[model samples]
Target: TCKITATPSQFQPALLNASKWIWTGENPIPGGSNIISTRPFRKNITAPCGKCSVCATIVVASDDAHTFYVNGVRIGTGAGFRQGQALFVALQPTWNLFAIAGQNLVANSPAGIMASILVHFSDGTSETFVTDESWKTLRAAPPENFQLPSTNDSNWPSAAVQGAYQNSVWGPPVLPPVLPLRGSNWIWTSDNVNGAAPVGSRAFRKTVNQCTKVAVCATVLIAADDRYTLYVNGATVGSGSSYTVADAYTIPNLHPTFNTFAINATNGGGPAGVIATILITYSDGSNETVVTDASWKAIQTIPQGFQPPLIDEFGWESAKIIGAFGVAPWGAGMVIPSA
Candidate 1:
C-alpha cells in the first residue's frame, strides 16, 4: 500500500508533460468489432481518502464511442479523440471500480483511446488515475449492484495494454496539451551558472525548521542530467538518472525542528544540471513549496559537514550556486512536479 504523501491522505499522480499521451487497459484489438454496448471494460483502483470530501474529474477519449461508471453507477462518456472529455466522479474511501466501454466504427477502421482522471483534495494535493494495467476488462456488461461495496468482480479479464495513443486509430494528440496538466512547480538554487558537465559527483543540502507540530507529508521531484541520490536526515530516500524528465518521491521524515535535506548529483554526458521542487502539506490543509534556489548549499564533493549534527554547524561553508537549470547560461530546464 502507498503511504499518504501529502497532508495526511492519498496516492500521487505521475506528472507527464503535455507532450506525452497515455493509453491503459485492453489494447485496441486490430480489426476490433464496432459493438458499443455490452463491451464492459473496467479498472479497479482503491482511491485513498481521509476526512476531506473527494473531488474527482476525468479526461478521456475512446474511439467512436465510450461510457464510464464509477464502481457500478454511470458517470459520463464521449466519442472521438477531438481532445478529451472531462467528467466529475464521486469516490469512496474504500472500493472504486472505474468502468469504460468503447465502441468502434468498423473492424477495418482504426480504434483506441487515451485518458486520465484527476482526484483533487483540500490539502492542495491530487492524484491522476490513468488508463493503465491495474484495470480489468470483461467481455460482457456489468451486473447489478456493481457499484455496491460488496460487489465481486474477480472473474474479469486482465486488460491488455494498448501501446501509446499515438499509434491508436485516433492518431496523435496535439503537442503540449493544456488539459491534464500537473499542479506543481520547477525550481533550482543557482541563478548565475549556465549549466555544468560534472567531472564527478556533486553534493547538495538544505535545512528547514518546522513550526507547527501537525503531521507532515512531503512529495519532492528529483532529476539530474545523468544521476542523483537523495538523502533526508542522512537516510537515503530516492534516486534517478533521467536528464529528460524528473521523478517524484514521497519524503516520510519531514517534521518539526531543524530538518536537513541533501542530494548527491552527477552528470553522465553532455551538458548536465539538476532541479528540485517540494510540496510540503500541513495538518490543517495548508501547504508550502520549497524549490532549489540560491539558498541551498551545493558542493563539488560531499561536504564533511553533511554528516548529521555537523550539517547544522555554524561554521559550515556553503557550496557554489549554479542557478536554476536552463536559465540563461544553463539553456535547458525540464520542469516536472512531485506527487
Candidate 2:
C-alpha cells in the first residue's frame, strides 16, 4: 500500500538556497494538493507539471523516519535504519516522467525521516485536481543499507564503552558531543543496569549513499535521574520516560529507520528537573531529496541563503539499505551531486 515513488506527478522542495519566497500549498492542480499556506524559508513539495507521469507514496508520519528521492535520484529508505525509528517506503518510478511537483526536485522532511505523498496524474494530462493520497501497507522487509554505522551513532551520550573503553572520554569529538548541540545541551547517564550500552555496538551503524540524519521526535525535559534508552543504530528504540517533559514519553508512532535520542540521567537522583531538556524533530537528507533538515533546520521561517544541502549520487550511484532491519557501515556513502 505504498508504491508510487513517482507515479509521474508529485515531488519535493529544493532548488534554491532560499532567502524569502514562501508559498506553502494549494496549487498542485495536476493531481491536487497545493496547501502552501506559508512554508516560508523552505517547505516546497511541488507538483506544477514539469515532468509528468505520476505515482507517489512516502509515509513516515509520527515521531518520524523516512527517506527518498527522485529527480536527483535517491529513492530508498524505510526507517531511520536505526536511531529513533519509524519508517515506511513505497517506490514506483522507473524512468523520466514529470508534470509538476518539481521545484525542489524532491523534498519533504518530518523528523528527518518522515515523508508521505500518494500521487496520481495531472499536469499535461490536464491539471486542476483529482485525489489519491492514502495508501500505506507494507511489512515485506529488505531495502535500507544507507551507510549503516555512520547511522547507528545517535549522539555522544556518556561514553568509555569498552576495550580501552572503545575510544572514550565519551566517544569521538572531544568533550561529549560528536554531533548533538542544538543550543547548549548535555546530560547523559549510562551505568549499565542492563541498558545504556551503545559503544562499539559498532558505535551505532547504518550507511548507504551518504548524508543521513535520524531522530524523529524528542521532548524530554526530565528523566528522574539515572539510566535511559533510545538508540537506533545500536538497537533500543524506547524508554520509560522518567517524569515530565512529556509527549507520552516520546512515541513517534513507536520506532523505525533512523532515530537517536539517548539520555542516561539518573545516578538515580531527582529534583532540579533531573536535567535533560529536549525539543526534537528528525529527518535530514540530501541524496537529492533536494533539501533535508525539514528544509533547513525544522521550519519556523528561516531561509535566508540557508544553503546546507547538496546531495547527489546519480553519477557514482550504488545503494542498499534493505529491511527486516539492519545495515551498518557508518551506514555508507559515495556522494557527488550538485546537478
Candidate 3:
C-alpha cells in the first residue's frame, strides 16, 4: 500500500458559512421504534432589473434524505447528512422559487437540514439565501405544484431553527468540490437582437495563459444558440444540442502554458448567441477565470484545423457582446446538470 500522508480537514466552513441547521418544530421525537416524518420548506426571491446574467450555487444536506426544487422543477436529491451536495443553477429575473422536502427516517433522532444559496448577477452584485427561521414549512404533505412560484405559502409556519451550522449533535458536513466563479455573458458575432444574425455556423476562439504547469482542476460552463461543439487545445471536449440548457465540462488535457478554447456554434434560424465561463484552479489554491467577452475572436466560417492550440487568426474579428447572461430570446434560468 502507498504511504498515508495528509488528510482533508473535517470542518467544512465553506459549506456552512451562511446557513443554519433548520427543521420542523416537532423534532427529536420520543420513541425507540422506527418512525418517519416528511415536511416541505420554501423560499421566494425577487431579482433586480437589468441584472440578467444570473448564476447560483447551492450547498445542502438533510437528515436521512431531502429533495430540492427550483421553480417547480426537481433539481436533485441528497441521500444522507454525512455529505453535502453542491448544485449549480441558472436563475431568471423576477420572482424565483426554492423548495425542499426534508425527511426523517427514525424516531428520537436528530433531524434537520442545512442549505446555502449564493446567486451572482452580471452587475457584479450577489445575494444569498440560507436555511433559517424565515423559510416557510408545511406540516402536512405539500399541495400539488407547491414548488411553483404562483402557489401561496402564506398559511405555512416558519421553519424552526434547530441549531447553527456546526452543532455538537451533527458535527460538520463533508463538503464537495468548490464551484467555479460566475459572471460570464452571452455573446455573438454581433449585438443584433432583432433577428439579424445570419442562419449559419460560426467559429469562435479564445486563448488563456496558465501560471504554472500543474493544475488542480479546470471547469468550463457553456451554452450556445441551437447547437455547439466545444474544444480545448484542439481536443474535443463535448457538444450540446439545445440552447435552452447549459453544459459543464472538465478539461481533460490541459496544456502547461497557453491553452486555446474553440467553439463551433450554429444558428438554425433567427437570433443566435453563445455564453461561457472557464475557471481553473492551481495547486497553490490560486484561481483564474475567463469569461466570454468582446475580446474573443470570431469568424463566419469554420476554417480547416481551426481548433488547434496555435492557429493563425488572419481575418477573425472580435466577437460582439449580445447582452448579459439572461437576455432576450434565451431568457434566464439556463438549466445546469446537477452533480
RMSD of each: 11.0, 23.9, 16.6
lDDT (10s digit) by residue, model 3, range 1-339: 111121211112234666787777764431112237887899887776655424456789888789888877777788676778876554554566889988888776777788888664444455677889899997676678878778889989998787776653566777764432246677787634575688888889999886554443356778888799988888788888878777777542355467788999998887888888876644332446789998899988779998998889998989988887777777776776442
Query: Which residue runs of candidate 2 sit more than 4 Å off their true CA positions?
Result: 1-58, 61-67, 73-76, 79-242, 245-270, 273-284, 287-339
Q: Summarize candidate 1's per-residue lDDT along 1-339 as a digit string, tens digits.
A: 223333322224433222222232233564243344435456676645553324354667666677776655666667776556645444553446676766666554445545676665444466676775556656555565544436666876665555454554446543222222133222322321444453666666777776554435465666665788877767667778776566766553355345667887776655555667665544333445677765666665465646353354443345443444454433454545322
Clashes of 1: 15
Model 2 lDDT tens row, 1-339: 222222111122111111111111233222122221111111113444343323332232111223334332344433321222111122122232111111221233211112223333323232221111211111112124212222221221211101111221111111111111122222221212232322211111112122244433232322322334333223344443433222112222213243333222223332211222233333332211111111111111223321222222122211111111111211112111110
What lDDT is obtained when candidate 3 is compared to the true structure?
0.71
TM-score of 2: 0.18
| Best candidate (score: lDDT) | 3
Q: Candidate 3: which pairs clash?
A: none
Q: Looking at candidate 2, what is the lDDT of residue 273?
A: 13
- In lDDT terms, how accurate is model 1? 0.54
Please list the residue runs of candidate 1 whose C-alpha ends up more than 4 Å from where it truly belongs after superposition: 1-198, 213-215, 268-271, 304-310, 313-321, 328-339
What's the candidate order when arranged by decreasing TM-score?
A: 3, 1, 2
Candidate 1 TM-score over all chains jointly: 0.44
Residue 278, model 2: Cα distance from true site in angstroms: 8.1
